[PDB]
Amino acid sequence: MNTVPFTSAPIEVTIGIDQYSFNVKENQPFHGIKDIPIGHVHVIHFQHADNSSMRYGYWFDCRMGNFYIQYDPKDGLYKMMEERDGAKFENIVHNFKERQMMVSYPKIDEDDTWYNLTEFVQMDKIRKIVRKDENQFSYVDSSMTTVQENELSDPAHSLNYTVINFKSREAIRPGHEMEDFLDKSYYLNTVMLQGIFKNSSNYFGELQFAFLNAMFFGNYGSSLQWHAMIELICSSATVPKHMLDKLDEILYYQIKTLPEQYSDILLNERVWNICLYSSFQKNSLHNTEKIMENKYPELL
């Protein structure tokens, strides 16, 4: 029911909306995307036809405001903007809908894929990871580094994922060196869950957001974050049963959605082999182990 209108499409571009994508031609009569499901975050993403280095996009929630896209010929990109005049915005969307210049968000009724990928992802959590507090939407692109990548440049244009480091004083209690290094339960349960995330929902939200940034933008730091958050759980002997059952469902949908042709660059052979076959939780991820063995037996 919500709509993201476009002023125009002056440059040939592949447009993504969540897990869907379509090609728009230079100056093609295209005025945006309609029938976007209320109740979920969304991502609208771009890859220019003349330059695939330009891979970028915007996380938004249509409940938070009226958003549109307009090409900036100076900065050379499709920009998200907020329209504060509700009546004007409603008038514009009505004209473009009447003239059928919009594509429809192509959701299959049976289809829970996007819910399954975004169940724990909240727009207010995204805005803490991606800091630009004058906008209600968050810009991400393929080259953005993480706070962790920037400790091993520009702080303003970075992904503020929670730093996970297995060989850090945060991860290891004095006098518990071997225990804490070989069993990450302390680091998962006391430091991260009780200490930083407050609950498993916030932890899963960041994990899911990292995956999606890895997949949709080929963001390398995001892929590192997604794997560190899986490995921290799989390397913990003591994990609530409900968290393991949920993690299995989360990973299942992520592996199901991943394009086959990106499996080699988006999946870390060492982490997945350790998680499924050597870790404390090697027998706890039934759905994920089955889809990984049937879809990516070469990686394993």
Binding site: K167, S168, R169, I172, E177, M178, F181, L182
Partner: protein, 237 residues
């Protein structure tokens, strides 16, 4: 990164460094039980922690009591090694703390890094060098203090005796590695070469005999020949 043949003079520069060898920490005799099963009996071990510049050997004796009621002892031995090295560093005045600790086995890297997180300026390094420090327990006086220990104990030795009065650290380390390689390849033969002449003794405060410069050259020759003799006997060459 990794200590190799290309960066070997670095051992003898004025940056304090220690080698740590964990080979002799967890030691067992394997035997048959009454029911014809197999069981282990632990015997006393040692951490071999050596300053290659000074010859200072911090020999921490590992008494069999530290294994009582513990599981996965080969894994625990690496962490106990890292614990005791960490404890040793913390015991030294700041100006005596090493800048680098080189482990002889790559399995010691994560245990030692984790125990030394408090010391971010101490580099924990592997080595490509195949060092024969396992043969420490072939030095009679080191073997004796380990096997007699009834409790955890640190014993301090100079593994170079008084050699540094007459030779450089580079030469002393070369002599030590040749003696230990020989003791590792054929202990009986190596020991005969060192001890066959009763007129050359071991001073009470030394590990090795009191060889003159000329006599060290003969000894060094006999050791290189033993290592080739045994390499021939081994490969049928």
């Amino acid at each position: 990164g990794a200590m190799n043949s290309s960066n070997y003079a670095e051992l003898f520069n004025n940056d304090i460094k220690l080698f740590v060898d964990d080979t002799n920490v967890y030691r067992v005799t394997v035997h048959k039980t009454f029911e014809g099963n197999v069981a282990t009996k632990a015997i006393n071990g040692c951490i071999f922690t050596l300053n290659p510049k000074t010859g200072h050997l911090f020999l921490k004796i590992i008494h069999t009591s530290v294994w009582a009621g513990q599981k996965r002892l080969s894994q625990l031995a690496k962490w106990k090694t890292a614990e005791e090295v960490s404890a040793l560093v913390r015991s030294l005045p700041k100006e005596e703390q090493p800048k680098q600790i080189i482990v002889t086995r790559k399995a010691m890297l994560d245990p030692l890094e984790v125990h030394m997180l408090d010391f971010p300026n101490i580099a924990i390094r592997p080595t490509e060098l195949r060092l024969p420090f396992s043969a420490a327990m072939s030095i009679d006086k080191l073997s004796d203090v380990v096997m007699k220990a009834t409790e955890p104990q640190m014993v301090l030795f100079n593994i170079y005796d008084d050699w540094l009065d007459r030779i450089s650290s580079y030469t002393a380390f070369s002599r030590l590695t040749l003696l230990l390689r020989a003791l590792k390849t054929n202990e009986e033969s190596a020991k005969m070469i060192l001890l066959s002449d009763p007129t050359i003794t071991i001073k009470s405060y030394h590990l090795w005999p009191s060889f003159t410069d000329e006599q060290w050259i003969t000894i060094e020759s006999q050791m290189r020949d033993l290592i080739l003799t045994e390499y021939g006997r081994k490969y049928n060459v």
